[PDB]
């Protein structure tokens, strides 16, 4: 699909848009009961969008995607994984501000 | 309805077995991706079971029951709420050992 930011809909959708992505990906594990996700989520989303295809953001609602949180050993939300060619290359938990997200994205993109 | 320990199945099951409970209730909010819930869960279930109906334990899987987590402002798991006559009277987050769980239940029960 056209957008660099998207909700993961299922396991195949994850395999295709994350594992098989040809660009680096930020996977944002969140949930509707997690207050801090409501700050982080839109923040990162906007900054990912500004990169115009150099990075993509897969949003994963943990409640709809329990398997995925198990596979990635997510124990709290928000968790954001940086992924490349199918593997995890960086991670953080909790909120980060704009400068920190910018640094996180530059480290991933180059 | 003979067990003092039970999984909450839906909204009405919650209003009936927790809000409308005649006994003190320990509500355990857990998920399959949360490691520490696998220590706490069985430990607390066993200790509640030993009380033979002076308290009950309502288990709430947060992924099957997002709504309850939103209502009770659960921000992380494990979160355990103590409830009586439909109100929240105590709370803790994370694992506790048997001495702590034992004090917690004596404070609740009396």
Residue keyed to tokens 């033979």: B52
Active site residue A47: no
A39 touches chain B (CB under 8 A): no
- Resolution of the determined structure in angstroms stands at 2.0
Count of CB atoms within 10 A of residue A14's CB?
19
Q: How many residues are listed for chain B in this entry?
A: 110
Joined tokens for residue B88: 């929240």
In order, the DSSP letters of A40-103 are HHHHHHHHHHHTTTSSEEEEEETTT-HHHHHHTT--SSSEEEEEETTEEEEEEES---HHHHHH
Determine the Cα–Cα distance for residues B75 and B72; give it in Å rounded to an integer: 9
Determine the Cα–Cα distance for residues B12 and A34; give it in Å rounded to an integer: 24
Residue keyed to tokens 């003092």: B4
Count of CB atoms within 10 A of residue A64's CB?
15
Determine the Cα–Cα distance for residues B44 and B105; give it in Å rounded to an integer: 10
A62 touches chain B (CB under 8 A): yes
β-pairing, B25-30 vs A87-93, is unpaired
Determine the Cα–Cα distance for residues B106 and B110; give it in Å rounded to an integer: 5
DSSP code of residue B23: S
Q: At B65, is the secondary structure helix, strand, or coil?
A: coil
Tell me the β-bridge partners of B27.
B58, B81
Determine the Cα–Cα distance for residues A63 and A30; give it in Å rounded to an integer: 8
Identify all chain B residues contacting A37, using CB atoms and an 8 Å cutoff: none
Long-range contacts of range B97-106, CB-CB < 8 Å, 24 or more positions apart?
A: B98/B43, B98/B47, B101/B43, B101/B44, B101/B47, B102/B47, B104/B80, B105/B26, B105/B47, B105/B48, B105/B51, B105/B55
Q: Which of A81, A9, A34, A17 is nearest to B74 (CA)?
A: A34
Joined tokens for residue A24: 């680096």
Long-range contacts of range A98-105, CB-CB < 8 Å, 24 or more positions apart?
A: A98/A43, A98/A47, A101/A43, A101/A44, A101/A47, A102/A47, A104/A80, A105/A26, A105/A47, A105/A48, A105/A51, A105/A55
With beta carbons less than 8 A apart as the criterion, state whether A27 and A80 touch. yes
Determine the Cα–Cα distance for residues B27 and B59; give it in Å rounded to an integer: 6
User: Per the omega criterion (within 30 degrees of 0), is the bond before A78 cis?
Assistant: yes
Lay out the sheet containing A56-61: strands in order across: A5-7, A56-61, A25-30, A79-84, A87-93
Query: Which helix (H) or strand (E) is A28 found in, with range?
Result: strand A25-30
Identify all chain B residues contacting A81, using CB atoms and an 8 Å cutoff: none
Domains and CATH numbers, chain B: 1-110 (3.40.30.10)
Q: At B95, is the secondary structure helix, strand, or coil?
A: coil
Cα–Cα separations (whole angstroms), residue A105 to A55, A81, A87, A109, B66 = 8, 11, 16, 6, 31
Q: At A30, is the secondary structure helix, strand, or coil?
A: strand
Count of CB atoms within 10 A of residue A46's CB?
13
> Which residue of A lies nearest to B75 if distances are taken between CA atoms?
A34
With beta carbons less than 8 A apart as the criterion, state whether A61 and A30 touch. yes
Active site residue B21: no
Q: Which of B66, B53, B62, B64 is nearest to B26 (CA)?
A: B53
With beta carbons less than 8 A apart as the criterion, state whether A47 and A101 touch. yes
Identify all chain A residues contacting B33, using CB atoms and an 8 Å cutoff: 62, 66, 69-70, 73-75
Residue keyed to tokens 């439909």: B86
Question: A-B interface: how many C-beta pairs under 8 angstroms?
Answer: 36
């Amino acid at each position: 699909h056209g957008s660099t930011t998207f909700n993961i809909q299922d396991g195949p959708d994850f395999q295709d848009r994350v594992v098989n992505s040809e660009t680096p990906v930020v996977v944002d594990f969140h949930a509707q009961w997690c207050g801090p996700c409501k700050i982080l989520g839109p923040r990162l989303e906007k900054m990912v969008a500004k990169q115009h295809g150099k990075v993509v953001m897969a949003k994963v609602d943990i409640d709809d995607h329990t398997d995925l949180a198990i596979e990635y050993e997510v124990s709290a939300v928000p968790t954001v994984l940086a992924m490349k060619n199918g593997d995890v290359v960086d991670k953080f938990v909790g909120i980060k501000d704009e400068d920190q997200l910018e640094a996180f994205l530059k480290k991933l993109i180059g």
